[PDB]
Structures are given as structure tokens and as C-alpha cells.
Amino acid sequence: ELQVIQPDKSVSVAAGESAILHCTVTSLIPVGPIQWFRGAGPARELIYNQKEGHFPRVTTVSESTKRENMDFSISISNITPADAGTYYCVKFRKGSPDTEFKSGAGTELSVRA
Amino acid sequence: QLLFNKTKSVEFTFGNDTVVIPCFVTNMEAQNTTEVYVKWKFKGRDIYTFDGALNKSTVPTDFSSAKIEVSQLLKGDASLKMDKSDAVSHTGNYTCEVTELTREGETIIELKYRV
Numbered sequence A: 001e002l003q004v005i006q007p008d009k010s011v012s013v014a015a016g017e018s019a020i021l022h023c024t025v026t027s028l029i030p031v032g033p034i035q036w037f038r039g040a041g042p043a044r045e046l047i048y049n050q051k052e053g054h055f056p057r058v059t060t061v062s063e064s065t066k067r068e069n070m071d072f073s074i075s076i077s078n079i080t081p082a083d084a085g086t087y088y089c090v091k092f093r094k095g096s097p098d099t100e101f102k103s104g105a106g107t108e109l110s111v112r113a
Numbered sequence B: 001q002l003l004f005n006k007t008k009s010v011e012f013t014f015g016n017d018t019v020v021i022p023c024f025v026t027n028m029e030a031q032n033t034t035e036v037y038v039k040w041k042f043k044g045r046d047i048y049t050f051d052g053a054l055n056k057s058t059v060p061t062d063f064s065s066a067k068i069e070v071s072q073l074l075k076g077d078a079s080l081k082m083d084k085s086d087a088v089s090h091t092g093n094y095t096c097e098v099t100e101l102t103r104e105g106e107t108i109i110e111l112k113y114r115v
């Protein structure tokens, strides 16, 4: 049974710096993508997925173009106080449309001075 | 991501009995098709899907001729074929989305009717 694991329950960054949010999966099946969101409800802001792109501030920390890769950590650049919140790494399964299969437990991000 | 060898647009005439919309992934590593999923999208709908795990193709009744050649899929060829009557009545931009296990990617091709 797949596990989506965010090792950091909390991240603390200075404003103007990058923030790294960690996520790893224990399996690459079932078939479907990992995406990052801020928030968990229907108002959640899509933060990252692998499709190019429209994510000028968010970037993959690993070699996610490789089949073997089970890490889906990301770096968010030029952190501002508006970026503070709870970020989730979520696994989907393919369909018309795709469905949410499993979520990480959350990483609370805070911006310090 | 899955990465693509991209074509901006393809053109066809009435002489084309079957129209092909190209889609070529350059870093496919799958050893079994059960690992792959393909979606072709047109004006906000999936006009063809291939679920590898179930080995099931699905098209709507107005794209009834639409298909891919599954034997070419593991080479990264996800090109869509359809007949001219389905093609002429559905010109515009198509989105090819390919997934292999957890890696994904998409690309867009404009299907054009030209004289």
C-alpha cells in the first residue's frame, strides 16, 4: 500500500530565501501524478506538477525526469510572508478525470524575519 | 516529467483517409504497458484514453474511429489516428498527455484543415 510521506511537519525560512518542501513515495504505482497544493479544501492553490508549467517560482529538487525517482520534493523561491501555510504532497490516479488517491500529512511553512 | 519531441501543428486535406496527430515521448522507460496511461484532449474533453492497467481504450461516439497503435506505445509513440470525417469536424488544438507510473507530461498539437 502506497505511502506519501512528508518528513517535515514544519519548515521555517527567512523571507527572500528559498523553501524546500520534502515528499517521498514508497511506490510508483498505481499509475498517476504527484502534485503539490497549498491548502486541502476546494480553494487549494496548485503549487506544482511536472507539466511545463506556469510555475515560475516552484522547482523540482530531484531528477524527476527519471523513471526510478521516488522523491517529489520542491523548492519555492523568493519566499514572502504570503507563502506561509500548510502544503500537501498528493498522489492521483488516472481517469476521466483523475482522482485523489493519497495525500501526505502536511508541512506547515512559516516565514521569519 | 516525461519529455516530448514536439510538433506545433499538422495539416490535412480531404485526400487524407486517415489523419495522424503525432505524439512522441523522448524519455519513455516503461517495460510493460500496464505502467502507461494516455489521454488525448480536445476542447475540454478526453476524446481518447488508454488505460494500460486495464488494457482499455475509450472514445466518445463522435470520435468513434479514434485510436492509437498500442504496439508503438513503449517506444514512446502515442500518436492518435482517426478517419477524415472525424478529423474534419474536429479541427483545433489537441492535448496529448502521457503518464508512466508517476512521471507525467503533455504536449499540444493544432490539427488544421487546409486546401
Ligand SMILES: *[C@@H]1O[C@H](CO)[C@@H](O)[C@H](O)[C@H]1NC(C)=O
Residues within 6 Å of the ligand: B010, B011, B012, B013, B016, B018, B019, B020, B021
Ligand atoms: C495528410 O497527408 C499528408 C501527405 O500525405 C501528410 O504529410 C500529413 O501528415 C497527413 N496529415 C495528417 C494529419 O495525418
Ligand SMILES: *[C@@H]1O[C@H](CO)[C@@H](O)[C@H](O)[C@H]1NC(C)=O
Residues within 6 Å of the ligand: B055
Ligand atoms: C488487450 O486488449 C486487446 C484488445 O483491445 C486484446 O487483443 C489483448 O489480448 C489484450 N491483452 C493484452 C495483454 O494486451
Ligand SMILES: *[C@@H]1O[C@H](CO)[C@@H](O)[C@H](O)[C@H]1NC(C)=O
Residues within 6 Å of the ligand: B091, B092, B093, B110
Ligand atoms: C489552437 O491553438 C493555436 C495556438 O497558436 C491558436 O492560434 C488557434 O486559434 C487555436 N485553435 C482553436 C480552434 O481554438
